């Protein structure tokens, strides 16, 4: 429970099913905003149900931020359900539950973004300290597919990843957070996404 | 179009108090200019004067979707619009009055504006006589002379609240009904 991992689909089934996989670390950002790098992807793969992504959140500045947020957030006092209390993971599921891959349409992909809500359905993320647990949450990802994905995750020492560029003004992130509460049916959409992604309970998802 | 006024019910039946954010400490953004007993409830009027808070709200409006949203019926007012997206509700603690993501009681939706008369006129549940009393009281207060609001809370604390607001169940629906309960007349910058 030292490292922070994230995983989920960036797309659930022109097309990018030909520039995959991307095993090289891509930056993980927030709401496609510049200077919001929080970590790196540990692999983008094509699988039966879509393009699955895995990554690690390493940005110390961001982890500090996320940590301060969880301290005052309602998630800090929220009653335990099925899992032990993990403010960090829970605040992430309240704040940035979605995933979005950025690409040009026709260095083919620039980054993966954590966001308030994915534009594509079933693009809900799963945050965790255990990569295997994280990937196993997706019942739509076969055993062989998972084993493969994890092989890539473990083959990389997070300790060798460069420091993410996270300096963006906090106001900019706050504005996105404010705008999110007004995204219509966000909570409903978020609930559907969970199903579309075939995520298994228990998870720290907040909807 | 300089000063910032806020108006709305803190309770719908049918000495200046500080105006804060989500009942948090050190989030005074201004002062209540009066709490009035009107037919439909307790109507509140206040002036948003905190320079720090106004700069922040202004900074937020600049990068918010509100600064890019197409004109509807009214002219663009990023500051007013971000306040209606961020803190559209009111809640009376009398200790203080807080601007919230959603009011504790129904019908407590706020109306932000630069014109106090326009603000109060949005509430058709407030009679003409009541409005005249409220406005006479309002304009009898020179704003450039109220004590500076203590706005020093870490930005983190406010952001946590904004993130939580996003997960308040039925928030946008309750805000819509709150508007009906308060009998607010269009056009207004409310976002629900
Ligand atoms: K491989």
């Amino acid at each position: 429970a030292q490292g922070l991992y994230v995983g989920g689909f960036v797309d659930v089934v022109d097309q990018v099913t030909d520039y995959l996989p991307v095993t090289e670390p891509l930056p993980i950002t927030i709401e496609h905003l510049p200077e919001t790098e929080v970590g790196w992807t540990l692999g983008l793969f094509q699988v039966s149900h879509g393009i699955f992504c895995t990554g690690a959140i390493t940005s110390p500045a961001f982890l500090e931020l996320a940590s301060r947020l969880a301290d005052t957030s309602h998630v800090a006092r929220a009653p335990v359900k099925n899992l032990p209390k993990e403010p960090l993971l829970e605040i992430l599921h309240t704040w940035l539950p979605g995933l979005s891959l950025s690409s040009i349409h026709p260095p083919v992909f620039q980054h993966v973004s954590l966001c308030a809500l994915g534009r594509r359905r079933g693009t809900v993320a799963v945050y965790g300290h255990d990569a295997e647990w994280v990937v196993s949450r997706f019942s739509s990802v076969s055993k062989s597919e998972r084993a493969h994905i994890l092989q890539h995750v473990s083959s990389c020492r997070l300790e060798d990843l460069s420091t993410p560029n996270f300096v963006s003004p906090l106001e900019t992130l706050m504005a996105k957070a404010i705008d999110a509460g007004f995204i219509r049916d966000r909570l409903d959409l978020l609930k559907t996404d969970r199903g579309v992604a075939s995520i298994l309970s228990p998870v720290y998802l907040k909807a």
Side-chain angles (χ1 to χ4, degrees), chain A residues 1-13 15-16 18-63 65-76 78-80 82-104 106-119 121-156 158 160-183 185-207:
Chain A
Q2 308 165 54
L4 199 306
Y5 298 101
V6 59
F9 294 88
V10 290
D11 181 37
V12 184
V13 59
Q15 112 205 337
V16 293
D18 247 353
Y19 302 80
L20 297 170
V22 185
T23 61
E24 214 173 67
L26 294 179
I28 292 180
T29 68
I30 303 185
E31 300 281 17
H32 297 303
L33 289 165
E35 292 173 347
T36 57
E37 303 184 333
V38 295
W40 315 85
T41 55
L42 290 176
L44 266 172
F45 305 98
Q46 218 301 287
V47 292
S48 303
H49 302 291
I51 302 173
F52 186 89
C53 175
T54 300
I57 306 304
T58 57
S59 176
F62 174 70
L63 290 172
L65 204 210
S67 185
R68 297 239 286 293
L69 261 20
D71 278 339
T72 55
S73 168
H74 163 72
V75 302
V80 165
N82 303 296
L83 303 165
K85 255 267 176 280
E86 294 289 349
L88 213 185
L89 303 179
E90 295 176 58
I91 190 65
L92 294 169
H93 278 298
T94 300
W95 179 19
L96 304 158
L99 296 175
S100 174
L101 172 70
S102 81
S103 113
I104 340 240
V108 184
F109 300 110
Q110 308 81 62
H111 62 266
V112 170
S113 275
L114 306 189
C115 41
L117 178 72
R119 174 178 55 179
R121 302 296 71 211
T123 57
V124 70
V126 167
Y127 292 102
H129 289 129
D130 176 344
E132 176 186 2
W133 177 78
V134 172
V135 185
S136 67
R137 274 19 260 156
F138 297 88
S139 67
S140 47
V141 180
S142 79
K143 183 183 181 180
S144 53
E145 283 171 338
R146 180 200 318 139
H148 174 213
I149 293 166
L150 294 176
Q151 174 178 43
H152 274 299
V153 173
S154 60
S155 69
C156 172
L158 310 180
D160 297 296
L161 289 162
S162 40
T163 309
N165 186 205
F166 190 77
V167 288
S168 169
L170 188 54
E171 282 88 346
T172 311
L173 295 166
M174 191 170 175
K176 286 293 184 183
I178 294 170
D179 294 340
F182 266 82
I183 291 170
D185 307 279
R186 178 171 174 242
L187 298 188
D188 295 310
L189 289 169
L190 239 33
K191 183 172 183 172
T192 286
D193 287 343
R194 181 170 180 171
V196 178
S198 303
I199 291 171
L200 298 172
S201 294
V203 280
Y204 288 99
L205 288 266
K206 292 289 179 184

